[PDB]
Each structure stands twice: as C-alpha cells, then as structure tokens.
Design a protein around this ligand. Structure first.
Ligand SMILES: O=P(O)(O)OC[C@H]1C[C@H](N[C@H]2C=C(CO)[C@@H](O)[C@H](O)[C@H]2O)[C@H](O)[C@@H](O)[C@@H]1O
Ligand SMILES: O=P(O)(O)OC[C@H]1C[C@H](N[C@H]2C=C(CO)[C@@H](O)[C@H](O)[C@H]2O)[C@H](O)[C@@H](O)[C@@H]1O
Ligand SMILES: O=c1ccn([C@@H]2O[C@H](COP(=O)(O)OP(=O)(O)O)[C@@H](O)[C@H]2O)c(=O)[nH]1
Ligand SMILES: O=c1ccn([C@@H]2O[C@H](COP(=O)(O)OP(=O)(O)O)[C@@H](O)[C@H]2O)c(=O)[nH]1
Lengths: 440, 454
C-alpha cells in the first residue's frame, strides 16, 4: 500500500533513494523538523507524497539527541567505548521521545501501510508502535556499523535494545559483518532459531535479516562532475590529493594528517609537486569529543605546514567549512587522488561518489580504508589500514605515480560494481523484501 | 688600545637574533677580540677555539649540558628574559638556577682572565652576563668595562619582584659604563637603583652608589644600511625568481622573527583575522607570510607559545581559506639573512608588532631593503624600541587588533608619493644612526673614563 518513512530528519544523499521508493508509490515522510521550541503537526503535500514535521523541547533534544544518540550510540557503534557518556536520565529521554513519536504518528497511519524506519535514533520504535497495537510490516535499516558483542554488551542498556529490535519484521544492514554481529549479540542473550537462512526467532518473536549495501546515483554524479576555475589553469604542475567528510572522530582525520606527514617525510621527490586538500565541516560541535578532534586538526595543520612548507608551496589545505555537493563532484573530477581512510564507517558514499565522478578516460586513484563498509565492494581501490601511517604513505606514493593503464583498469572494475548496485537497486531490494513479509 | 668584546651568542666566523648581527657589524668598524660561546655543548674542558678572519679574532668555549641548563635555559631564558619583557607570570625562579648562573659567570671570568692585556678595554653584551664585571673586579681587573643591555630594562614594580633583584643591581654598578637601547630603559634602571640605595647623580648620566662610580647613556643599535640595499637589490635564487612572477596579482604582508612570546605572534594573527573579516575586498588578493624559526625550544613557555601559534594558523586558514587561496603562510624555519633582504624588497608591507622589544633590527632592515623608487610600508608596534626612531612608520598598539587591521588596510592601499615620503624619512634616521655610529659613540665614551687604580 502506502509507504511510511520515519527518520530523524526529513528533506522537504539518502534523500534520492527514500524519495525514489516513496514515489513509486506514495505516502508519508514523517520526521523531526530539526528545530526546537514547543504545537500541532505540520504537513506539506505534493502529489502522492506528504511531509510531516514537529518540534522538540530543549530538554528532550538534549537527553535523546545530544546525549543518548550522539554521546552513547554513535561512539559505541564506532567501537569507541572510551568515548561513551552513559547517564540514566539520557536513556530515559531516548525512550521518552521514541514513545512520543509513536503517539504523534498514530493518527496518521492506515491499516495496510508499510513502515520503513531509519537509523540508530529510532532503535526502540518498532516496540513503541506494536505496544500501541500496530501490526503492519515494519522494516529497519541501520546506516552505521553494528558492533561485536564484546563492544555492544558494554552498553548498560544493551539487553533492552536487543529485545526491542526484535519487534521489527525486517532488519537491514550495510554489510554481512554487521548482520552477523547483531545475530552474535542476540545469541549471547537468548536462544535464536534460524528456521532457514536469514529468517529468525527469539523470545517467540519472528523477524528476517538482510544485507542492503547503500549506493549512489551514477548518472547524476557524472552530469554535475562534467559541468562548467582559474585555479585549475594555475595547477597543471601540482597533483591534488583530496578528502571530504564531516569533522567526526570515526573519520580518522588526525591519523590522515600523520600519514600525509609520512608521505612528505619519506618521499622528498614530491616536495613542491603535490597538494593535499581536506574539507571537514563542523558536525555535532557541542559534544566534547568533537571539539577535541577539531582543535587537534587546527594544531596539526599549523604544524605540518610550518615544517614542510616553502615560500611558494603550502603542502596542506585544511578547510573547516561546508561545500555544496555539486561543486565537490567537480573537485573529485580534477583530483588525481581520492583519500578516504575512516577508522570505522557504515558505508562512506564519498568513496563511491569519487569513483563515479572520474573522467573514465583519465581517472584519479582511490585510496580506501579496510574499515569503511565500501571496502567490501570496491576491491580495486588501494586498500589500507589507517593504523599503519607508512602503509598509507606508501599507497599515496603508489597512487601518485600510477600509469594510466592501471588507473583505467582499477577505475572501470569499481565503476562496474557501483553501477550494478545503484541507490535505486538498493531501495527497490529493501521495499520488495519488506512486501513479501506476512503481517501479524 | 685593544677592544675585547664578550657575549653569550656569537656570530660564527664562517642563527636568528639581533645581538650577534649588531656586534658583527660593530667589530667590522672596530676590529677586536670576540670572546663567547661556540654554540656547542660537551668538552667544556677543551682549550679555547681561536679563529682569525681579518681584524676580528674569535675565541670560543663550549658549555657543559648542565651549564647550558642552569645558566642559559633556567636563569637567563626562564627568569631574566620573561621578567625583562614584563612577563612575571612566566618566571621560574629557584635558588639553584641562580647559583648555576653565578657559577658559570665565574667559570667564564676565569677563562677570559689570561687573555687580558693591561690597556684592554672590555665591552660585555647582554643579560646573560650582568654579573660579569663583578667577577672580573674580584679577580683584580681594573680595566675599563662597559655593558650594553640589548633588551628593555623593566620598571621597578616588575624588576623588584625578582628575588635576586638587589644582587643584580649591586653587580651592575661594577661596570664603568652601562648602555641602554632607550631613555626609558636607562631611567627604569636608575629608578630601581634609587629604591634600594642612595644614588648621587651629577648631570644626568654620572653616578655613585655604595661608593662605586659609573656612567649611564642611551645607544640605540642600528644596522649597516648601504650593505642591506646591495644584498636586497641582488637577484633571487633561480627557483624563487620563477615564483616571484606569480605574486604579481597578490599583495604580500611579511613578518619574520624568532618564535618568542615577546613578539606577539598570536595577537598579530588575530589582527590579520580581523583584516579578513572587516575588509572582505582583500579576499583572494593578499597573503601574509610569517617566518618564525623555533627559539629556545627546551623552555616550557616557548613550547606553549609555539602550540598556540600553530593552532591559530590552522584555525584562521580553516575558516577563511578557499580552494585556490590560502590567506596565511606560517613557516617555522630559519632563512638566510641575505635572502630575507630580497624578500623584504618585494613585499608590499612589513608587519612588525612585538609586545616588548629591545629595539627590533628587522624593522630597520625592512626599511633599508626597500626600493627607494617603489617602497613598501612598515607597520610598527609602539612597544618596539625602534618606534622611538621610526616615527614615520605606521605606529600601532598590538593590544587593539582592529587598529592593527586598519593600519594593514591603509598600508595596502597607500599611494606611491606617501610611501616614498614615509620611506625617505625613516631611511634618513637609519642612515644617521648607523651601526658604525653606535660602536663609535660607545667605545669613545668608554675611552673617556679613567680606569680605577689600586
Ligand atoms: O546529521 P549529521 O550532520 O549530524 O550527520 C550526518 C549523517 C551521518 C550518518 N551517515 C551514515 C550514512 C551512510 C549512507 O548510507 C554511510 O555511508 C555513512 O558511513 C554513515 O555514517 C548517519 O547515519 C545519519 O543519520 C546522519 O544524519
Ligand atoms: O641567542 P638566542 O638564540 O638565545 O636568542 C637570540 C638573541 C635574541 C635577543 N636579541 C636582542 C637584540 C637586539 C639588537 O641587538 C634587539 O633588536 C632585540 O629587540 C633584542 O631582543 C637577545 O638579546 C640576544 O642576546 C640573543 O642572542
Ligand atoms: O562539505 C561537505 C561535506 C560532505 N558532503 C556530503 O555529505 C555526504 C557524506 O556521506 P558519507 O557516507 O560519505 O559520510 P557520513 O556523513 O554520512 O558519515 C557525502 O555525500 C558528501 O558529498 C557535502 O555535501 N558537503
Ligand atoms: O630566519 C631568520 C629570522 C631572523 N633573522 C635575523 O635575526 C635578527 C633578528 O633581530 P631582532 O632585533 O629583530 O630580534 P631578536 O631576535 O634579536 O629578538 C635580524 O637581524 C634578522 O634579519 C634571520 O637572519 N633569519
């Protein structure tokens, strides 16, 4: 029937896949406005689709969003226990708004609707709804990694989370290892029955699990990359190594600066002839662990440039700013090397967008972290372990001097994979699998 | 007859710092024996290293790792330097560093002794050696001994906070002559001395304290201006010559100094950030290059300021940078003086804004290096000793970042006629108070004093 999409924020990107499914049918996109202060539920309609937003109180945002989502789940799911900041009033807050959002979404549902829930903010949502009587087919997709038991079981509230996740009919993950980790955690807590492959029972409750590796829109990226500057006419001499991501400790930005320093240290042949540009807009800047990383990068930029810089050559361009998506695609195109080395990442679309944006007759080289979800598919990238800075240095030198013949063959294999598994292929696979599920 | 010069830091016969440059030029006018530290550590016991290069004889010694620690890193650089630059919060006084300082002053006095002739005139340089005359008098040398302090002398409220302030004052009175950079320095000394004891002053400049007689005077250090013009007019190294024809659209703001907290580098960066924020017309059209070689890197205060400076470079470029334009170039590196002079010449603006500075040679070098037919603009802190002389500079208070930014904007848009006017007046002063003139006045005043006798 109608498709109901629930996510932390709505867009009146992840957008194209969600908007895509919800267009092939229509329905509702329900989510928080992204603003605060106190009100009746706001709606905007455009054909078969409606957008539904709502505000949050200051205290509710703090406990649920700033604290539990961003200071407990985010760090823990990225294998950063040292960074989790669990307090009880935050866990209560996270339950309270999940419940509240079940209330608000109640007068809008219809008995044959399908329901698609997105991401770590809404883990207890299936539970809140089923408590309020809903029996519709409910699917969940987790965009970030799912951690092994040894990490997950450290959450003081891990057993509740596991119980509630089982109130979904379908659980979708970015990779196979995420799927197994979730099943591993459950198995530690309770007995699980695998009737047949990817169909399960625990505490009597029934549910299915599957891997849906999220992708991009290859044709669209190609268009904006090829679009219509003086800097380019000036730099036919300098090869550009380029990185872009949110300023987040999962991304391993300081380890990246250290690998670049290592390149400059052990490969003097490149002095004056290469540049590294890192774009990193501020994200979640009111959490302490984020401010920590931000000051580190300021210091590291100042230090590396001060050491290796010359009167007419600045080795490192660090820009703490947001750039528009279309512009970035063009930058990908003229960049000789794409540096994507996160410490832990659900997928990382940046790595996919980089390959999609390349001129296929003269493509740049992708250097990719083994811990990004994308490493499972993009096997023709230069795969690296970011904890070995000298290996990342070695790979960067390898990428800078790679013959056009090898550049083309790696790039084509990777573009092949990205084409087959589009954003549209992603969203169709989820919705189809969700439909085959028999409701209770 | 013979001039004996003593300083900690020497210029090597064949490092950033104004003392060694000043003395080197001073001795090229004079001739003499230059006694001082080689710069190396270890083999403290090896004989004096004697090198002859024209009319200058060098004699150098090594220091032990431990002598370096106490005399240099602890007391000179962590007690005297911060205090004399009005940074009492940075002073790390403990009694063993003081004892260390006196011990090596005495050790050095023993080493000089056998090289002294009876009619030698002795010129001691700078804060490392305040107790030197006193060690010499104790070993019966009755020669003319002059002292020149290259840094400011702080007012009584600051100076008197030094636990050891009274001994320092007592020992300074063992010199026959004391020279200072500015009248304010000379007056501060006399003020401090007056609090401790009755000083009898005749004229303005002639004194007795504890029955010791001595003279004070102001000798603002200068440069060798024609020589700077020649080294500045030379061609750039082939690499940088090629680069120079790319900075034709961009105006250059240039600064150079040791990475020292006296130099106000963080505040200067904040002034530039203010230029960027309040004068957006300059975006993509200017560049500020800061050359800041590490100085005294084993002292905590110096490590702290370096970390502050690094953060600010990263932050300001992170905030105001663009894909094809980096506003600020920070270089934690030493550059050859001759290269620096050429860089001064092609810069449009010299930014010289220390919080406290004994004189600041860089500000004078900057004006001497300019092409008189197309000169850049000096922006100068009122707290540099040189601001007493370089009156036609753009004088600013680096505590007011907006006033520094306004001066930057004014310097960047200044007409050719105003630039020449300003440059000529400053260059006139610099030519009249030559390094030759400095040396000449000091030595001549010293030769006018009759030696004490037994
Ligand atoms: O809203 P933000 O700016 O604080 O963070 C941006 C998104 C980061 C996160 N992006 C994930 C999505 C994707 C796309 O499926 C993966 O490529 C990333 O590795 C993974 O980090 C998160 O899942 C979203 O809910 C966030 O809104
Ligand atoms: O020898 P360092 O490396 O510990 O420091 C360099 C010099 C900085 C200092 N130069 C001063 C000299 C001069 C000119 O002689 C003034 O221009 C400066 O304002 C003043 O800071 C210090 O006084 C000297 O003894 C030092 O050798
Ligand atoms: O300044 C920026 C930085 C990044 N992005 C986009 O943000 C998305 C980040 O997604 P990714 O999966 O790579 O990382 P995430 O932020 O979700 O962890 C990418 O599509 C980028 O194109 C952007 O539009 N402007
Ligand atoms: O990389 C550098 C930095 C500085 N200097 C020189 O070091 C001296 C600095 O003297 P100044 O009086 O400005 O300050 P100081 O360092 O003594 O406090 C000047 O002669 C500069 O030309 C240099 O030759 N190379």
């Amino acid at each position: 029937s109608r498709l109901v999409v629930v996510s932390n924020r709505i867009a009146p990107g992840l957008a194209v896949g969600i908007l895509g499914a919800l267009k092939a049918a229509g329905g509702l996109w329900f989510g928080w406005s992204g603003e605060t202060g106190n009100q009746p539920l706001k709606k905007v309609k455009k054909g078969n689709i409606t957008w539904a937003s709502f505000n949050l109180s200051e205290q509710d945002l703090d406990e649920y969003y700033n604290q539990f989502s961003n200071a407990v789940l985010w760090p823990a799911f990225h294998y950063r226990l040292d960074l989790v900041q669990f307090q009880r009033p935050a866990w209560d807050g996270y339950l309270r708004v999940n419940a509240l959002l079940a209330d608000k979404l109640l007068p809008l549902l219809q008995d044959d609707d399908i329901i698609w829930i997105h991401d770590y903010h809404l883990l207890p949502f299936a539970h809140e709804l089923r408590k309020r009587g809903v029996n519709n087919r409910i699917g969940f997709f987790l965009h970030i990694p799912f951690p092994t038991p040894e990490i997950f079981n450290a959450l003081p509230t891990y057993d509740t989370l596991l119980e509630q996740l089982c109130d979904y009919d379908l659980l979708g993950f970015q990779t196979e290892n995420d799927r197994l980790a979730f099943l591993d955690c459950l198995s530690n807590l309770t007995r699980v029955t695998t009737r047949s492959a990817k169909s399960h029972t625990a505490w009597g409750k029934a549910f299915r699990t599957e891997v849906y590796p999220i992708g991009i829109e290859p044709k669209e990226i190609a268009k904006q990359a090829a679009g219509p500057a003086q800097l380019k006419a000036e730099l036919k001499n300098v090869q550009n190594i380029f990185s872009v991501e949110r300023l987040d400790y999962s991304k391993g930005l300081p380890e990246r600066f250290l690998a670049y320093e290592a390149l400059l240290e052990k490969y003097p042949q490149h002095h004056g002839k290469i540049r590294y540009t890192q774009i990193a807009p501020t994200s979640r800047g009111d959490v302490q662990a984020y401010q920590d990383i931000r000051h580190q990068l300021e210091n590291e930029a100042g230090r590396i440039n001060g050491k290796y810089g010359q009167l007419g050559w600045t080795p490192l361009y660090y820009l703490n700013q947001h750039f528009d998506r279309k512009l970035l695609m063009k930058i990908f195109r003229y960049s000789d090397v794409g540096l994507v080395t996160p410490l832990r990442d659900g997928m990382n679309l940046v790595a996919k967008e980089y390959v999609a944006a390349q001129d296929p007759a003269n493509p740049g080289v992708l250097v990719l972290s083994q811990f990004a979800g994308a490493a499972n598919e993009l096997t023709s990238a230069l795969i690296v372990n970011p904890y070995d800075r000298d290996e990342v240095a070695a790979a960067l030198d390898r990428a800078l001097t790679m013959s056009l013949a090898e550049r083309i063959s790696r790039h084509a294999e990777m573009l092949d994979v990205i084409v087959k598994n589009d954003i549209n292929h992603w969203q169709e696979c989820f919705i189809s699998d969700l439909k085959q599920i028999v409701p209770r």
